[PDB]
Amino acid sequence: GNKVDLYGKAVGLHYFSKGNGENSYGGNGDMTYARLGFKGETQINSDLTGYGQWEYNFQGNNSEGADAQTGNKTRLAFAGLKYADVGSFDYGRNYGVVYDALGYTDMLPEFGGDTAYSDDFFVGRVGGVATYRNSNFFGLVDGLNFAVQYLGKNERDTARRSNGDGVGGSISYEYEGFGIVGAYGAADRTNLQEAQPLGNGKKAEQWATGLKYDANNIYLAANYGETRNATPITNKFTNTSGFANKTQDVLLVAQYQFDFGLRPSIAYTKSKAKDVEGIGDVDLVNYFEVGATYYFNKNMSTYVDYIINQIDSDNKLGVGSDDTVAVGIVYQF
Amino acid sequence: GNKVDLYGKAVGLHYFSKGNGENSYGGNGDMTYARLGFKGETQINSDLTGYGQWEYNFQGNNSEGADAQTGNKTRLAFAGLKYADVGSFDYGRNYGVVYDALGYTDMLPEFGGDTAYSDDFFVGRVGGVATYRNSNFFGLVDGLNFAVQYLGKNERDTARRSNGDGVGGSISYEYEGFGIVGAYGAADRTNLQEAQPLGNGKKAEQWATGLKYDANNIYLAANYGETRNATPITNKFTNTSGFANKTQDVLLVAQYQFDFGLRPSIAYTKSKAKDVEGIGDVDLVNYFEVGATYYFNKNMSTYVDYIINQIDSDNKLGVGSDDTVAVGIVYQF
Amino acid sequence: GNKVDLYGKAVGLHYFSKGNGENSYGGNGDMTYARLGFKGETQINSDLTGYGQWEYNFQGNNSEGADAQTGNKTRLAFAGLKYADVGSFDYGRNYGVVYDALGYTDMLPEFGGDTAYSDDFFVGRVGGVATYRNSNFFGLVDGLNFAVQYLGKNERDTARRSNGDGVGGSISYEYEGFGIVGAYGAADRTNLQEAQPLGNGKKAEQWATGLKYDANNIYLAANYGETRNATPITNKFTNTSGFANKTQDVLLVAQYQFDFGLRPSIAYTKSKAKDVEGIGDVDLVNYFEVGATYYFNKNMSTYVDYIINQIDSDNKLGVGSDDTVAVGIVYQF
């Protein structure tokens, strides 16, 4: 009793931004890519299931010469066991447990989910996490789920992609279409992260809450959160980098799914950094979004996503101020 | 109604050239490799189909240490829609539209197709092309096909793999075994390509025609074409590089497919560069070919391909003059 | 009549060693990874089969930034034909023919098989080998198998991953649960390998014998062998490297497979280098092993593997002296 799906997609994708767009939200040019993965689950006995998943990203916008591997990576690689009502345990490269909140708004046709950074403690995909999850409180409270996650230190060659040991968890409750969630994690920073000019402190912290309504073809969600010493940043003026001492983040989304397959979307996102060395307060992300995806069926879709960028041109860190529109065509299986 | 094929091959492949063969057509040594891809198509309704394809090359002749990734790349990555008789549209990394002509002779057991360079405007696979294709003139003229293709600028880190914006197209007509085709495209060159010592001008151009007979187990084809500022070249003496101001190219092939599975092949190819800075005229490619593939069935084959190289030893750009023979064994699915 | 299996596994894997473990057997930290491959065989006729295989390793312990590709590689890539009782021939990247002996002890839950180095002449996976194998002596002697293998020179950018031309072979005999095997190969060393400070001589040689009992849920095996100028080594003091002039190697393993799925393991391995320039004799590997794998079924397992490391802290080459324990969870298909 094993079921394994090989799965994947090919995404023709193009970004339009003015001139460069070295000063835009998303950039400019061909951004085509493809994903390949497997996900499998085996029924060991009536109460026990083993499972594994691996997912890889292959850029489609590189040449076949020396730059062939740019932006190619494993996204996920983990395996786990799930026991009757006791919970599931998995270990590997997987989603940070703060993403249990951030996933609420990470729903846009192309962009969005800006604070769910990869290899960034608990907000995005990350290496070496052991994750325990429980559904419906051991089978006793329908709708009430929680998780705890242990993050092992990754002392890598850059501060940006490193972390120390840490712990995080999440609790959520869902009831006839509504959902609420909170997630928090904290971890040591490594000596290399500390040596960065930007950000100061021995612990990283990230938290977020989420509210959503997801029924009757309507999708509405909001996320609010803060981080300490955890959001990666760069000052394009001094070419210095590191982490924001604090940030406060808000993300809102509203979508509707029409039976004929159109799914319009609007959204707002703002992330503001505070106590940044040599700057003080400074916006990281600030935009409105209008977009749509058209689903032809479960295997084919197309979309447009427009980021009306509200970052101003005198942003003190050099964050791009121009708009970006993406257009995509997607075959997936 | 989705059909997706995972497909691939493992190719044990060895090249024999004298000494190095640093001065040969093809080189020398192990050239084993494998390909993995998917290709999928979904029937959206009776008249509309969505489709996607991704294909990757994994060299099999690298070690498992630092050189593990040499020559590994995505070859194709695109998705598209095809509507009743109106045409097909796809976007991504795909074959340049001049390959609609060059494919006629790109038929040898191992070598051949020399002017179908990758990441070279319209002659080979290339990034960021939007391609429209029409079969049988909207359903009105059986056998008459055309295409137009829009190439978005790729300002990459090398001249060799860069291009500016451009447009190309092709028209072909097939009738009881005979086929004729023409294709032309033109594009801006980028500032980096212009700064190269070899080749001068603001536009690249490539064109080719093709004639073939493909029936009764016979395959015969010829391609003639020219390029301006588009064929990549190197002078091994001065170690300078760039593009040939002009080239003129001819490719001929003849093959026969015996029912017992042997498919012998002979061929001629010559590509000559003109107005090369500091040289004038100079051959790029000039050889005869004799070879065969033996098909055991649709999944297994073996072949030998011998390139009787007619480049002379005093070639002014340093183009290799020695012969090369390849021997391959292929399992594919 | 083609059968192709896509296959793979996701392995959550963690190593525990004291402090660094820069001075341990196995290291420390997340070592998660995934494998993807295909293996196919086509029945050409009643007596002839074609076959191909490709296998790749994707690390799961890298970040998605610049280090994304570390430790990623093709492990195997070859294709072949197998004729009735005459034998099989394949060419590509495959197991060196000395591994026909070393495979006997390469059976531990995580570690073990220490002398089966990759890209190391005939002991491990290697590029450009043509391998002929015969089962049951042409169909005439049940249980008696042999092989010969031709290794083409690989002049790569490092000594460690290079080799010259060579030949190796193996002969084995199996009879109601017992097996005996011998394998030997020799090859030229390349000029780059010769220029290394460690190891001196024009030929590499590697041989090994094996004995095993494999029946009634018992597994016992021993391997003994020697090498000349073939085992790669480093002196962490002088930061010099190359090959051991000689080594002598022994590997023992004993395991039991309980019907309920537990498979305990114990093992001993010692590899000693001799005539090392500026040192004389020096241990390379010396440990005992205790471990177990628990198989839930054919798709799911977990294991622990503990290396009681007997290398001392004053080892003259700087070989790590500390212990390592690994813990893994594996989903495979």
Short mmCIF file of C-alpha atoms in Angstrom, two decimals, chain A:
data_model
loop_
_atom_site.label_atom_id
_atom_site.label_comp_id
_atom_site.label_asym_id
_atom_site.label_seq_id
_atom_site.Cartn_x
_atom_site.Cartn_y
_atom_site.Cartn_z
CA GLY A 1 0.00 0.00 0.00
CA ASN A 2 2.39 2.73 -1.26
CA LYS A 3 1.19 5.75 -3.33
CA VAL A 4 3.91 8.02 -4.88
CA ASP A 5 3.16 10.92 -7.17
CA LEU A 6 5.82 12.38 -9.40
CA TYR A 7 4.64 15.98 -9.92
CA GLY A 8 5.89 19.15 -11.60
CA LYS A 9 5.08 22.25 -13.62
CA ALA A 10 6.47 24.29 -16.45
CA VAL A 11 5.96 28.00 -16.00
CA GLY A 12 6.49 30.50 -18.90
CA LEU A 13 6.86 33.66 -16.98
CA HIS A 14 7.76 37.26 -17.93
CA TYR A 15 8.22 40.38 -15.73
CA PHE A 16 7.65 43.93 -17.06
CA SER A 17 9.24 46.75 -15.15
CA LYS A 18 10.41 50.14 -16.34
CA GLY A 19 13.96 50.33 -17.72
CA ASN A 20 16.27 48.09 -15.66
CA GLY A 21 14.13 47.22 -13.42
CA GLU A 22 17.12 47.37 -11.09
CA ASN A 23 14.91 49.82 -9.09
CA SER A 24 11.65 47.78 -9.28
CA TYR A 25 9.73 45.48 -7.01
CA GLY A 26 10.24 42.27 -9.03
CA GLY A 27 12.84 42.95 -11.78
CA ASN A 28 12.37 42.59 -15.51
CA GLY A 29 12.82 40.02 -18.26
CA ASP A 30 12.25 36.28 -18.66
CA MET A 31 11.62 34.49 -15.31
CA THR A 32 10.44 31.09 -16.76
CA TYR A 33 11.17 28.06 -14.53
CA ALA A 34 10.05 24.44 -13.89
CA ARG A 35 9.59 22.32 -10.71
CA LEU A 36 9.96 18.56 -10.33
CA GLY A 37 9.15 16.59 -7.16
CA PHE A 38 7.83 13.41 -5.71
CA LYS A 39 5.56 12.90 -2.75
CA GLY A 40 4.84 9.55 -1.36
CA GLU A 41 2.98 7.88 1.47
CA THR A 42 2.91 4.26 2.56
CA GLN A 43 0.19 2.70 4.82
CA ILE A 44 2.32 0.64 7.26
CA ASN A 45 -0.76 -0.51 9.22
CA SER A 46 -4.26 0.83 9.85
CA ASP A 47 -2.92 3.45 12.23
CA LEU A 48 0.63 4.21 10.93
CA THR A 49 1.68 5.92 7.67
CA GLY A 50 5.31 6.76 6.46
CA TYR A 51 5.77 9.58 3.94
CA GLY A 52 8.52 11.51 2.07
CA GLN A 53 8.74 14.44 -0.28
CA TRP A 54 11.43 16.04 -2.45
CA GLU A 55 10.86 19.16 -4.66
CA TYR A 56 13.42 20.96 -6.89
CA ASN A 57 13.40 24.24 -8.82
CA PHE A 58 15.02 24.40 -12.29
CA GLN A 59 15.30 27.93 -13.72
CA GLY A 60 14.28 28.19 -17.34
CA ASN A 61 15.85 31.63 -17.91
CA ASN A 62 19.51 30.63 -17.85
CA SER A 63 21.66 29.90 -20.83
CA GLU A 64 23.22 26.43 -21.40
CA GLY A 65 26.74 27.84 -20.74
CA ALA A 66 28.38 28.80 -17.45
CA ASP A 67 25.43 30.42 -15.77
CA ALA A 68 23.32 27.19 -16.34
CA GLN A 69 22.85 26.53 -12.59
CA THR A 70 21.80 29.97 -11.35
CA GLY A 71 18.81 29.82 -8.98
CA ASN A 72 18.60 25.96 -9.15
CA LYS A 73 17.94 24.35 -5.79
CA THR A 74 16.19 21.71 -3.74
CA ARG A 75 13.20 23.39 -2.07
CA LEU A 76 12.04 20.48 0.14
CA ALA A 77 13.53 17.12 1.22
CA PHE A 78 12.11 15.36 4.23
CA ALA A 79 10.53 12.11 5.52
CA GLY A 80 8.26 11.39 8.44
CA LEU A 81 5.76 9.09 10.21
CA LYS A 82 2.19 9.81 11.15
CA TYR A 83 0.50 7.79 13.90
CA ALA A 84 -3.37 7.43 14.19
CA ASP A 85 -4.33 10.46 16.25
CA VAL A 86 -0.96 10.90 18.14
CA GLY A 87 0.59 13.25 15.55
CA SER A 88 3.12 13.37 12.71
CA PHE A 89 6.90 13.76 12.92
CA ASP A 90 9.14 14.63 10.03
CA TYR A 91 12.80 15.72 9.65
CA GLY A 92 14.63 17.39 6.75
CA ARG A 93 14.33 20.56 4.65
CA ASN A 94 10.77 21.79 5.14
CA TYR A 95 8.65 24.89 5.86
CA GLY A 96 9.53 26.84 9.00
CA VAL A 97 6.62 26.66 11.51
CA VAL A 98 5.93 30.45 11.37
CA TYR A 99 4.88 29.77 7.78
CA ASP A 100 1.83 28.04 9.41
CA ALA A 101 0.66 31.62 9.92
CA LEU A 102 2.23 33.33 6.91
CA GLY A 103 0.72 30.77 4.47
CA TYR A 104 -2.60 32.56 5.06
CA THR A 105 -1.70 35.47 2.79
CA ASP A 106 0.86 33.73 0.61
CA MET A 107 -1.87 33.32 -2.05
CA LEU A 108 -1.17 35.81 -4.86
CA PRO A 109 -0.93 34.80 -8.56
CA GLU A 110 2.84 35.46 -8.63
CA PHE A 111 4.15 37.79 -5.92
CA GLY A 112 3.05 38.18 -2.22
CA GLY A 113 4.30 36.20 0.82
CA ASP A 114 7.17 38.75 1.07
CA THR A 115 8.08 38.06 4.69
CA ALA A 116 8.26 34.25 4.19
CA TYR A 117 12.01 34.40 3.35
CA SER A 118 13.84 31.15 2.54
CA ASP A 119 16.62 29.96 4.94
CA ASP A 120 15.47 32.48 7.46
CA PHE A 121 14.87 30.78 10.75
CA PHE A 122 11.09 29.86 10.96
CA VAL A 123 9.35 31.93 8.21
CA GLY A 124 10.25 29.98 5.03
CA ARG A 125 11.78 26.75 3.85
CA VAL A 126 14.83 25.89 5.88
CA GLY A 127 17.29 23.05 6.48
CA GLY A 128 17.48 20.68 9.40
CA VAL A 129 14.03 21.07 11.06
CA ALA A 130 12.37 18.38 13.09
CA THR A 131 8.63 19.08 13.06
CA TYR A 132 5.87 17.55 15.16
CA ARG A 133 2.23 18.32 14.18
CA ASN A 134 -1.06 17.40 15.77
CA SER A 135 -4.48 17.54 14.16
CA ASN A 136 -7.74 18.09 16.12
CA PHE A 137 -5.91 17.86 19.53
CA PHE A 138 -5.21 14.17 19.56
CA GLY A 139 -8.63 13.50 17.96
CA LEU A 140 -10.38 15.29 20.88
CA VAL A 141 -11.07 18.82 19.64
CA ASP A 142 -12.20 19.07 16.02
CA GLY A 143 -10.49 22.02 14.30
CA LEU A 144 -7.74 22.66 16.86
CA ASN A 145 -4.20 21.93 15.54
CA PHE A 146 -0.71 22.66 16.85
CA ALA A 147 2.89 22.08 16.02
CA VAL A 148 6.33 22.47 17.48
CA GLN A 149 9.48 22.54 15.46
CA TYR A 150 13.20 22.13 16.42
CA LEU A 151 15.71 23.92 14.24
CA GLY A 152 19.27 22.67 14.26
CA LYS A 153 22.08 25.13 13.83
CA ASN A 154 23.31 25.71 10.19
CA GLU A 155 26.63 27.51 10.22
CA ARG A 156 26.87 28.21 6.50
CA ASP A 157 29.29 30.41 4.51
CA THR A 158 27.05 33.42 4.65
CA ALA A 159 25.21 35.18 7.47
CA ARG A 160 22.14 35.48 5.28
CA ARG A 161 21.65 31.65 5.02
CA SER A 162 22.88 30.69 8.54
CA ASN A 163 21.10 30.10 11.86
CA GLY A 164 21.70 28.79 15.33
CA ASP A 165 19.64 26.22 17.29
CA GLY A 166 16.08 27.22 17.97
CA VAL A 167 12.51 26.22 18.78
CA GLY A 168 9.20 27.45 17.32
CA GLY A 169 5.51 26.30 17.33
CA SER A 170 2.05 27.25 16.15
CA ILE A 171 -1.55 26.76 17.24
CA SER A 172 -4.58 27.25 14.96
CA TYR A 173 -8.28 26.76 15.12
CA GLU A 174 -10.70 26.38 12.18
CA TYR A 175 -14.46 26.40 12.27
CA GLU A 176 -16.96 26.46 9.31
CA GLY A 177 -14.78 28.48 6.99
CA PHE A 178 -13.00 30.75 9.54
CA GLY A 179 -9.44 30.15 10.70
CA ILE A 180 -7.21 31.78 13.29
CA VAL A 181 -3.52 31.02 13.87
CA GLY A 182 -0.54 32.13 15.91
CA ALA A 183 3.11 31.06 15.49
CA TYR A 184 6.33 32.13 17.25
CA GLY A 185 9.93 30.84 17.10
CA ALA A 186 13.28 31.96 18.53
CA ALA A 187 16.83 30.82 17.83
CA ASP A 188 20.45 31.77 18.52
CA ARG A 189 22.22 33.82 15.85
CA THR A 190 25.63 32.52 14.80
CA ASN A 191 28.93 34.51 15.23
CA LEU A 192 28.93 35.30 11.52
CA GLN A 193 25.41 36.82 11.70
CA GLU A 194 26.52 38.90 14.73
CA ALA A 195 29.54 40.28 12.78
CA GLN A 196 27.19 41.81 10.23
CA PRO A 197 27.05 45.67 10.37
CA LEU A 198 23.21 45.55 10.37
CA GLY A 199 21.35 44.09 13.35
CA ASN A 200 22.55 43.46 16.87
CA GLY A 201 21.65 40.76 19.40
CA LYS A 202 22.13 37.14 20.41
CA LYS A 203 18.59 35.81 19.55
CA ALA A 204 16.38 35.92 16.46
CA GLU A 205 12.58 35.99 16.95
CA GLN A 206 9.67 35.90 14.57
CA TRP A 207 5.96 35.82 15.24
CA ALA A 208 2.81 36.16 13.34
CA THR A 209 -0.93 35.83 13.63
CA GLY A 210 -3.46 35.07 10.97
CA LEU A 211 -7.21 35.35 10.31
CA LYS A 212 -9.01 34.05 7.32
CA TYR A 213 -12.35 33.17 5.80
CA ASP A 214 -12.23 30.49 3.17
CA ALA A 215 -15.66 29.26 1.97
CA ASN A 216 -18.40 30.00 -0.58
CA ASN A 217 -15.75 30.86 -3.25
CA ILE A 218 -14.50 33.72 -1.10
CA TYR A 219 -10.95 33.98 0.27
CA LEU A 220 -10.05 36.75 2.77
CA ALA A 221 -7.03 36.75 5.03
CA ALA A 222 -4.83 38.98 7.10
CA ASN A 223 -1.48 38.38 8.76
CA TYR A 224 0.25 40.63 11.35
CA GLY A 225 3.69 39.95 12.82
CA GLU A 226 7.04 41.17 14.11
CA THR A 227 10.58 39.97 14.02
CA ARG A 228 13.71 40.78 15.94
CA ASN A 229 17.17 40.40 14.47
CA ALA A 230 15.66 38.00 11.84
CA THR A 231 14.59 39.77 8.58
CA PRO A 232 17.53 40.03 6.13
CA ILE A 233 18.35 43.47 4.79
CA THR A 234 20.78 45.37 2.58
CA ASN A 235 21.68 49.09 2.28
CA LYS A 236 22.48 49.60 -1.46
CA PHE A 237 24.24 52.88 -0.61
CA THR A 238 26.93 51.69 1.77
CA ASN A 239 26.82 48.12 0.38
CA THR A 240 26.40 46.80 3.94
CA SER A 241 24.02 44.03 4.99
CA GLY A 242 22.66 41.87 7.77
CA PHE A 243 19.38 41.82 9.67
CA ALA A 244 16.70 44.33 10.75
CA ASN A 245 16.76 44.89 14.49
CA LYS A 246 12.95 44.88 14.41
CA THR A 247 10.23 44.73 11.79
CA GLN A 248 6.45 44.99 11.87
CA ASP A 249 4.56 43.35 9.03
CA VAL A 250 1.09 43.30 7.75
CA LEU A 251 -0.42 41.42 4.82
CA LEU A 252 -3.96 41.47 3.57
CA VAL A 253 -5.55 39.55 0.72
CA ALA A 254 -8.95 39.18 -0.87
CA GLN A 255 -9.88 36.88 -3.70
CA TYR A 256 -12.96 35.41 -5.33
CA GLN A 257 -13.17 32.21 -7.34
CA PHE A 258 -15.74 32.32 -10.15
CA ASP A 259 -17.07 29.03 -11.32
CA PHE A 260 -15.99 29.79 -14.90
CA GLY A 261 -12.33 29.79 -13.61
CA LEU A 262 -11.33 33.40 -13.14
CA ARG A 263 -9.88 34.18 -9.71
CA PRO A 264 -9.28 37.91 -9.17
CA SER A 265 -7.09 39.06 -6.40
CA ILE A 266 -6.30 42.23 -4.53
CA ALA A 267 -3.87 42.64 -1.69
CA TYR A 268 -1.87 45.00 0.51
CA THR A 269 1.50 44.31 2.09
CA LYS A 270 3.74 46.50 4.25
CA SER A 271 6.82 45.55 6.13
CA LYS A 272 8.65 48.25 8.10
CA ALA A 273 12.09 47.96 9.67
CA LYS A 274 12.90 49.83 12.92
CA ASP A 275 16.12 50.67 14.73
CA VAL A 276 18.23 49.96 11.63
CA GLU A 277 21.81 51.03 12.38
CA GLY A 278 22.47 54.46 10.87
CA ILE A 279 18.85 54.85 9.63
CA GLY A 280 16.13 54.26 12.23
CA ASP A 281 12.76 53.42 10.62
CA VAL A 282 12.56 52.41 6.96
CA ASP A 283 10.02 50.60 4.79
CA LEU A 284 11.01 47.21 3.32
CA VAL A 285 7.88 46.38 1.41
CA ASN A 286 4.84 48.53 0.77
CA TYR A 287 2.53 47.90 -2.12
CA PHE A 288 -0.93 47.23 -3.33
CA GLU A 289 -1.62 44.27 -5.67
CA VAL A 290 -4.27 43.65 -8.29
CA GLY A 291 -4.19 40.43 -10.30
CA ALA A 292 -6.05 37.39 -11.59
CA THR A 293 -5.46 33.78 -12.42
CA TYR A 294 -7.64 32.02 -14.95
CA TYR A 295 -7.85 28.25 -14.35
CA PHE A 296 -8.68 26.29 -17.44
CA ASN A 297 -8.71 23.11 -15.35
CA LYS A 298 -6.55 21.43 -12.75
CA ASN A 299 -3.54 21.21 -15.11
CA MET A 300 -3.61 24.57 -16.97
CA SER A 301 -3.74 28.20 -15.93
CA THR A 302 -2.63 31.69 -16.88
CA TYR A 303 -2.24 34.81 -14.79
CA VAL A 304 -1.33 38.47 -14.52
CA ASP A 305 -0.07 40.09 -11.29
CA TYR A 306 0.47 43.86 -10.93
CA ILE A 307 2.40 45.33 -7.97
CA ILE A 308 1.59 48.98 -7.49
CA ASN A 309 4.73 49.71 -5.58
CA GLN A 310 4.42 52.34 -2.77
CA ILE A 311 8.05 52.38 -1.77
CA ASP A 312 9.23 56.04 -2.56
CA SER A 313 12.39 56.85 -4.60
CA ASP A 314 14.28 58.26 -1.61
CA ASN A 315 13.85 55.02 0.45
CA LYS A 316 16.87 55.13 2.80
CA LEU A 317 18.08 51.54 2.14
CA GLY A 318 17.76 51.74 -1.63
CA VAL A 319 14.70 49.45 -1.82
CA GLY A 320 13.26 49.58 -5.39
CA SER A 321 10.33 51.98 -5.97
CA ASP A 322 9.02 51.04 -9.41
CA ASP A 323 6.02 48.86 -10.23
CA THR A 324 6.23 45.34 -11.69
CA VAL A 325 3.70 43.34 -13.71
CA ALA A 326 4.11 39.56 -14.26
CA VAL A 327 2.42 37.43 -16.90
CA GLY A 328 2.55 33.60 -16.60
CA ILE A 329 1.27 30.49 -18.38
CA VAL A 330 1.43 27.28 -16.31
CA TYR A 331 1.16 23.61 -17.18
CA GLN A 332 1.28 21.46 -14.00
CA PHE A 333 0.76 17.77 -13.16
#
